[model samples]
Target chain A: ALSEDDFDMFYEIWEKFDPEATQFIEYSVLSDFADALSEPLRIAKPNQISLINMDLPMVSGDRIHCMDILFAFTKRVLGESGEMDALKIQMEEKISYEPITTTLRRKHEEVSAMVIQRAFRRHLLQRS
Target chain B: ADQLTEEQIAEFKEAFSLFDKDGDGTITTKELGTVMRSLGQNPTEAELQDMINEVDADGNGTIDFPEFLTMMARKMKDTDSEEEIREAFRVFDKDGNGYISAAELRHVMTNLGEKLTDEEVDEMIREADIDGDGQVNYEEFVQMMTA
Candidate 1:
């Protein structure tokens, strides 16, 4: 849980570095961003901040999306192990070669049918 | 349970569906431990075992809907500040995408009865959006809510 005070501080610090409102910041300044978030804001330990910086996507050309950093911080602050659970769940779904919704729908139908069957059998038993 | 309002019962159903992640109509102990950890609760294996043993009336080791409701009704007596705060955000985060998009903000605000003008909505986003991304992340939303 990022306290309101810590969140406010992140905004203040981030605005100074990205004054033009550019969505991405240069990779060179990434360490400074981590440093600021770790201090004054005190949102995470140095190790946690380091882990966040290390895990950002490399798709961008020498630039890190600001929201990526912000979100990574949010994840760690929220008790995640600085890992993207979304990506993990997605990968697992992909490996299964079936859409998650399809599995869920099938399982739900099976459960519902069993429930109905049991209820109908009980109704007949009580009537007899 | 007798005094629970319909509204509370409906919320319990939603929470039950959420915890039953595999959609099998029951929650395994694994699911219970994982969710509790996400909510910052750390129950020991023995404690969790006891909880299931006590609540698993049918000897299934999994909590069915009836068992879930029993647990939920009793659990309602306690609250976690962080969990409550996260749940409050989840209400507006309709898609659970981790960020509240501009469209979602507009939809929720207008539907809440006191509709705001487009300019008002835009201003709300602008004030909370730190990176000019035009969406409110968890931290930004928390800051906005507390203020």
Candidate 2:
């Protein structure tokens, strides 16, 4: 369970470090995404959300998990950079939560979205 | 059961087939999930299993078309929401793999301090095992409780 505080903490560190994830899954949008569902999952209290594997498995099967979705969304939108190892080392220092850190790390070096292949090229050229 | 109109029966089959995505003449818990999400109803895995448990007339863990039709007619006739039914099914799906196995029924009942003879448990399964798989699925439970 990521408290509002937990998401806040994650947002603070990631935003500070500029992990380049802001182009997709902006904190509030991700919060809304978590809230935009049914049953016990409906964000019961303000500013709190939980994404358990049990809940997501049926929706996505094994095709994508929450981490994978976040990774894919950013990949489609922002692509990636070569300074990841440095970013990761700094990310570790800034955030202590294992799941957030782990998911970020797993997708650090691999952020490409075939769905938006041409846009990434544009983004690459723009980065120059 | 014979009192249903032919059109009503045909309409029921159509609904059942649409839901039977794999065309296996039966609906798995996963298959039911399609409309569930489409309707903005995101049920937990256990909740899904509970739905299956509520309608699976055969102990085989899948709902045959016959079982599905029977369940639907009752759903229209009854005042219970899908939520209440899932809760009922969840109570019995103690092992939580989605089906209410005889063992779970026996275990829960035993814990509740009601000791059923092996004969009684066998009779319960026999009554619900319409598909002859020797377990109680949701459709069977619904038919038994309603019929």
| Chain B TM-scores across candidates | 0.44, 0.50
Model 1 Cα shift for residue A115 (angstroms)? 61
- As a whole number from 0 to 100, the lDDT of residue B15 in candidate 2 is 84
Most DockQ-accurate candidate: 1
lDDT of each: 0.62, 0.53
Candidate 1 residue-wise lDDT, B5-60, digit = tens: 67788888898887788998987878888889999999998888887788787897
Docking class of 1: incorrect
Q: In CAPRI terms, where does candidate 2 land?
A: incorrect
> Model 2: iRMSD?
25.3
**TM-score for model 1?**
0.26
Judged by lDDT, which candidate is best?
1
Residue lDDT tens for model 2, A10-125:
35434433356432343323434544433323443343213321222211111222343433333323346545334434434531112233222222111112112323454466
